[PDB]
Design a binder for this molecule. Structure first.
Ligand SMILES: O=C(O)CNC(=O)C(=O)O
Ligand SMILES: [Fe+2]
Ligand SMILES: [Zn+2]
Ligand SMILES: [Zn+2]
Lengths: 487, 10, 6
């Protein structure tokens, strides 16, 4: 074809394909083109450099020259055409100023957050309120003792992470001032993190999930109470031996690549980092333990008034208004220090500031006690997703499939068994019963939608299998009611 | 913009 | 930087 269009390289015309896409970058010195994945750059650098300046030139051309900071109050901090526009939440200018008025945001009430000294008190207060089934307030636990939450011994830091995970492990990382996400080698982040004096840009990753790393997955685990209620954990039990065999023998096995991986995250952020208001995907609950550093959460209860304000905030193109300034005083401030743990139920809207370099272990999960609220957040996400175009990776992996499997593999069996004896589930399983109805009703809406306009992309559950599950669900449900009407 | 927890499922 | 997509 044309030699000048050859990478690079690579020395090739069409790249094999993290994902190079179909993208090239050109050397401002030697003028030869490079596939992005062949340029030696990482995704986080793609937009940074005004001049580049490939490896075949750096020893005799110098390092790439990055754009000069022209508009520190804009995500596009490098664009002179935006100099005159408004301060964007949370650009460098925005965060800088927010840090100074920050502590004026009111503290939460006792009904919003409950602070406890240790895991034993948490347990007591958790049970007073009705436990996980009736879990509505956030808890801060100062000392983790009694939580049964496996964590690293301090002295553990970023260095240990990169050693365990791998220097070339790529993690989706937030460019804080640009308010965007890019891949970045763990070793690159560590270099940048290590340099505490020279930080032209701040970085914060939330999304290093290590549940598939045989070493890390043993070092930081969710509290026991989280493991006991996790729907994902119930469906993909990390069991062995005969238990696993029984698993396969019932059609209860689910592929590892279908497992939502969100329950074991490592988060590391630079001081000055800000993450803006959001509800965790799928309306999942969150555990959040500070190994090192400090975090300030700004939180708002999952009420309809708040949900309406949030939905509007998320669908408006406006970029200059802090959600707290329009939430009618719903935003409360809570500080979490080294060693302390936050436990957040479904639906809580929250932003977070990182006053100090930090290292956090956290995780997301779904549970039956928050089923309604999880569906409610799901409707919220879908409503927002109609207006704005986002990426599927920022939403809960395989949300619907997870429920099809939970209904099939868990609830169906429980209802069937009760039906086959006595047996009014309201006695020793009121919770299981009410969840079944709630989940069923939601899934009836999904079914009708799939019929009205067809299935989504390829896989994973054929429409026919869904209809067969629903038929079986309706049957056992109708039977159990008859038993409840009789008794 | 796009600064939010990220997976890829799967 | 100057880039392109194919
Ligand atoms: O760590 C912060 O910057 C953001 N993290 C979250 O909001 C979370 O873990 O639910
Ligand atoms: Fe969050
Ligand atoms: Zn190439
Ligand atoms: Zn060159």
């Amino acid at each position: 074809p044309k030699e000048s269009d050859r990478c690079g390289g690579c020395g090739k015309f069409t790249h094999e394909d993290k994902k190079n896409d179909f993208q090239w970058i050109g050397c401002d010195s030697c003028q030869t083109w490079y596939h992005f994945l062949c340029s030696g750059l990482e995704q986080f650098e793609y937009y940074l450099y005004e001049k580049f300046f490939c490896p075949k030139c750096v020893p005799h051309t110098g390092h790439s020259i990055r754009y000069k900071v022209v508009a520190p109050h804009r995500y596009r901090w490098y664009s002179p055409n935006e100099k005159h526009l408004g301060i964007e939440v949370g650009s460098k200018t925005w965060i800088e100023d927010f840090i100074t008025r920050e502590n004026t945001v009111p503290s939460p009430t006792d009904d919003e957050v409950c602070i406890v000294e240790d895991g034993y008190e948490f347990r007591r207060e958790f049970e007073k309120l009705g436990g996980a089934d009736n879990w509505g307030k956030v808890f801060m636990v100062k000392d983790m003792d009694g939580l049964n939450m496996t964590m690293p011994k301090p002295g553990f830091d970023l260095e240990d992470v990169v050693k365990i995970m791998g220097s070339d492990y790529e993690v989706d990382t937030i460019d804080v001032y640009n308010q965007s996400t890019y891949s970045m080698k763990l070793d690159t982040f560590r270099k940048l993190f290590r340099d505490t004096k020279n930080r032209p840009l701040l970085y914060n990753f939330l999304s290093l999930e290590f549940s598939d790393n045989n070493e890390m997955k043993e070092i930081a685990k969710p509290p026991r109470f989280v493991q006991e209620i996790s729907m994902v954990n119930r469906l993909w039990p990390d069991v062995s031996g005969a238990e696993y065999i029984k698993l396969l023998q019932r059609e209860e096995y689910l592929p590892e690549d279908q497992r939502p991986k969100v329950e074991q995250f490592c988060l590391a952020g630079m001081a000055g980092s800000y993450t803006d208001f959001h509800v965790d995907f799928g309306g999942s609950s969150v555990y959040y333990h500070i190994l090192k550093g400090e975090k300030i959460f700004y939180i708002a209860a999952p009420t309809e008034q708040n949900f309406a304000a949030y939905q509007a905030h998320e669908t408006s193109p406006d970029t200059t208004t802090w959600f707290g300034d329009i939430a009618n005083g719903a935003v409360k401030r809570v500080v979490i220090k080294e060693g302390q743990t936050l436990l957040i139920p479904a639906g809580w809207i929250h932003a977070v500031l990182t006053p100090v370099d930090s290292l956090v272990f956290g995780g997301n999960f779904l549970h039956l006690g928050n089923l309604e609220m999880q569906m409610r957040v799901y409707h919220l996400e879908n409503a927002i997703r109609k207006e704005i175009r986002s990426e599927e990776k920022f939403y809960f992996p395989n949300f619907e499939l997870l429920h099809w499997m939970y209904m099939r593999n868990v609830l169906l069996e429980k209802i069937t068994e009760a039906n086959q004896e006595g047996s009014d589930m309201r006695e020793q399983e009121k919770n299981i019963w009410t969840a079944s109805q709630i989940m069923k009703a939601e899934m009836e809406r999904w079914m009708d939608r799939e019929l009205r306009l067809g299935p989504e992309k390829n896989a994973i559950l054929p429409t026919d299998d869904k209809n067969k599950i629903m038929i079986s669900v309706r049957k056992q449900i109708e039977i159990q009611t008859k038993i409840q009407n009789a008794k | 913009q796009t600064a939010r927890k990220s997976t890829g499922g799967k």
